[PDB]
Amino acid sequence: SLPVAAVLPELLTALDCAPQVLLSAPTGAGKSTWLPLQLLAHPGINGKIILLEPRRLAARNVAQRLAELLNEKPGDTVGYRMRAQNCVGPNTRLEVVTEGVLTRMIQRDPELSGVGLVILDEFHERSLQADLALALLLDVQQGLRDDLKLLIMSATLDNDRLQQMLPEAPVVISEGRSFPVERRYLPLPAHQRFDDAVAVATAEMLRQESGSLLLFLPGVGEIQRVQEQLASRIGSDVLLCPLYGALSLNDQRKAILPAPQGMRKVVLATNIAETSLTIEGIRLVVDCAQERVARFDPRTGLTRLITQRVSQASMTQRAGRAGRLEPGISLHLIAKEQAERAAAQSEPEILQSDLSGLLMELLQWGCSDPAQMSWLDQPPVVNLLAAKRLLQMLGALEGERLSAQGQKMAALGNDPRLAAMLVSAKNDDEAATAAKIAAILEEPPRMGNSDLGVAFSRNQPAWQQRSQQLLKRLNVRGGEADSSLIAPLLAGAFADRIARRRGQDGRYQLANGMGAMLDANDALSRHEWLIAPLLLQGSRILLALLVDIDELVQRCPQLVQQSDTVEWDDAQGTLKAWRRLQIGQLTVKVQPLAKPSEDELHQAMLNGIRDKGLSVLNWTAEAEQLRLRLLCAAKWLPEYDWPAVDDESLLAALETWLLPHMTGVHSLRGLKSLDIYQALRGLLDWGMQQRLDSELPAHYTVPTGSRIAIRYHEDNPPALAVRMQEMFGEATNPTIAQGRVPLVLELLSQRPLQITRDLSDFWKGAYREVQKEMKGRYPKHVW
Ligand SMILES: Nc1ncnc2c1ncn2[C@@H]1O[C@H](COP(=O)(O)OP(=O)(O)O)[C@@H](O)[C@H]1O
Ligand code: ALF
């Protein structure tokens, strides 16, 4: 039997004593293909069971495996639901789900009627789908369906956050068939390509060690190139078996299954063989130690893809993949030192993803705050703010709640951009166009062509499947789709992705101000205006267009704004009053700013300041000293909210701090003479100004009644420079900032420059300055 059966009784005995159960067992213990069936044939659990598989290279496979384990040809008792299709029949009471189908299923049936068990598989991968699902399930176990059992399966012995959140939940832990694997480290050379060096390393291992080999790579292109390279350096008894995506599920089993006797096999797998899939016959592992992770960018609204070194947890998963059958060997293609510097664990997907779909789903569920849910990691605040802004651009929000259009979008259970494109259609023709566009953007094609019109025409059975599904969710029973309708719809959802060329050789510039690249001979480089919904970025460098359509700005919808600006550029010594018709940082039209109102060209002068610098304004001595004093206050009187006065802050806040004081300027010359002291001072409410005048004063009152201005500085301490006939009161040394910073006294400037000091207790060390020209006349408390 399988190593997990050893805990089958205990598991059962815990599945009935608690609403939640956590089971941890290493990879290879039949958690996905043995445990579900044994829980089916158990009277303790009532109803049907759903098993969440986040990957879906494992989901289809685990449905097929669990069906084969009963001779059942999945559909009879074991079924599955994918995003586009599914397989269920009256007698199936166990269903494998994936692609966020469970989150939608809970949205549509929040009592999960008919289900007594939900199994969250592969939870250590920390997918965002599973996090959301768990929050929803825990919320369902609050209302009715108290009886609903939650089994959370992880594959790592330690689950810190999970116990920390469900500390009243039974932890079942399996052990077993683990052999030691010698860990070897081989850094790759820099004069060799990646595919070439990995192939050389793998071929060397095959020639130096026995058995079959598992090789982890960052993606399918790496897999294909490394395989082509291996072809030459490998003997005749070696079978190269890719593993990715789907190729027939036959050669997939060709790589999972052992190698026919008299043959060794090299399996070329993505991280899907890290814990999701169990490769057989392996005792040699080659880990490239590089992987592709997603990082959302609130600035650009793009999820860029970054190739980074893998964590330690994953390196250990991979090394252990070679010890299931006998003593093995893992070879990591980095240097031991870099491996020890590696990140301890992987980052939860929820801390680095786009949460627009997540925000929308939590809103439909009736949430006030996205963070008021049962989370392992709390959704980052910046990304929640970006999700909210995106949902506002798309009209999905009405205040903090969902609006009507937003509720329709939330209905379709889609990526919010695509959902908004689906909802914005009026006709049935527009709706079908949007359906096919959505099918293509969810599952882009890997053709050497980058136009969206050819994809829109190019046939595909799965795109048609998903468009039919979306059209039945939309309830449009007859429509016709042509390409002339692609561009208007896109404009409502991918508006921040419109793009204008930069010369020929069509490196472009996007509306969010990052620019993109096509390849120098794509058909589309001949076009002024593109709109690119699919972009690839990562590793501030570009920006390569993956899928995009042609566009003609004439007659387009009404998403363009006006930016006026008035500058006085010196080179040719003339003024400048432009009005740009822009759509988001891309200048469409430039026209003269003729006959402008006074509100505009107040704003236009503000834009001019923003583009030429605050040096433009009339920085008088009092004003410079005020800016210095505010810097100093922020660093010395922290407990009060001192408005930051760096250049960027003031340039961004011009609207709120300089505009109010401008009514009555009417010209650029009159603005350039405006004293800004009062506007900076206005940056403070009454009482903050009083605070800054008493604490951090403009001038110190020495013990003779002679007010003497202080010199503030960004870096240096404040300095007095008093004539020192008058520094005889000796209070204890003058101090400012509620007694925390003592003035640096320039005791001299009588003639100047004889001692600078900050202690006022060199009286008992001055002991020189009793010699002054006539005499001192200073000693011992004169005044
Ligand atoms: N398609 C398959 N072909 C052969 N063996 C399989 C298959 N699926 C599962 N197994 C067997 O099940 C075990 C690993 O699967 P499983 O216990 O589901 O791993 P996990 O613990 O990651 O769920 C192995 O011992 C293997 O013998
Ligand atoms: F079902 Al598993 F690792 F938990 F493959």
| DSSP assignments along 677-693, one per residue | HHHHHHTS-TTHHHHHH
Topology annotation, domain 5-173: Rossmann fold (3.40.50)
Annotated binding residue 212: no
SS3 per-residue string spanning 388-435 = HHHHHHCCCEECCEECHHHHHHHHHCCCHHHHHHHHCCCCHHHHHHHH
**What are the tokens at 565?**
């600006």
Q: How far apart are CA 472 and CA 484, in angstroms?
A: 23
Which atom of ligand 2 lies closest to the CA of 30?
1
Does the Cβ of 256 fall within 6 Å of ligand 1?
yes
Residue type at 257 in one-letter notation: L
Task: Map tokens 């269920």 to a residue.
Answer: 88
Distance of alpha carbon 144 from alpha carbon 747, whole angstroms: 80
Residue type for 289, please? A
Q: What does the alpha-carbon distance between residue 118 and residue 548 come to, in Å, rounded to a whole number? A: 40
DSSP state of 751: -
**Contact between 500 and 489 (Cβ < 8 Å):** no
With the most atoms of ligand 1 within 8 angstroms of its CB, the residue from 7, 31, 32, 33 to mutate is: 33
CATH topology match: 5-173 vs 181-350: yes
CA torsion 518-519-520-524 (nearest 10°) is -50
Deposited resolution, Å: 3.0
Side chain identity, residue 594: A
Give the separation between CA 502 and CA 477, rounded to whole angstroms.
Answer: 44
Tell whether 25 is in a known binding site: yes
Contact (Cβ atoms closer than 8 angstroms) between residue 65 and residue 280: no
3-state secondary structure of 233: helix
Instruction: Let me know: does 79 contact 94? Beta carbons within 8 Å.
Output: yes
Cα–Cα distance, 74 to 580 (Å, whole number): 61
Ligand 1 center from residue 247 Cα (angstroms): 19
| Class of domain 181-350 as given by CATH | alpha beta
Q: Tokens 């009784």 correspond to what residue?
A: 9
* Protein residue with its CA nearest to atom 1 in ligand 2: 32
The per-residue DSSP string of 712-747 comes to --SSSPPB----SSSTTS--SS-EETTTTEE-BEE-
Beta carbon of 119 within 6 Å of any ligand 1 atom: no
**How would DSSP label each residue in 500-549?**
EE-SSTTEEEETTS--EE--TT-GGGG-SEEEEEEEE-B-----EEEEEE
3-state secondary structure of 202: helix
> Is 576 known to sit in a ligand binding site?
no
Q: For residue 366, give the 3-state DSSP assignment.
A: coil
Helix (H) or strand (E) holding 610, with range, is helix 603-612
Copy the structure tokens of residue 451: 């136009």
- Phi first, then psi, for residue 145 (nearest 5°) are 55, 40
Q: Which amino acid would we find at residue 140?
A: V
Rounded to 5°, angle at Cα 592 from 577 and 606: 30
Find, among 188, 389, 360, the residue nearest to 289 by Cα: 188
Q: Is 478 annotated as a binding residue?
A: no
Strand duo 238-243 + 78-81: pairing: unpaired
Considering every ligand atom, which ligand is closest to the CA of 174? 1
Q: Which of 57, 278, 279 to mutate to test the pocket of ligand 1 (most atoms within 8 A of CB)?
A: 278
Do strands 561-566 and 577-583 pair parallel, antiparallel, or not at all (unpaired)? antiparallel
DSSP string, 620-659: -HHHHHHHHHHHHHHHH-TTS-----SHHHHHHHHHHHTG
Pocket of ligand 2 (CB under 6 A): 27, 31-32, 121-122, 153, 155, 275-276
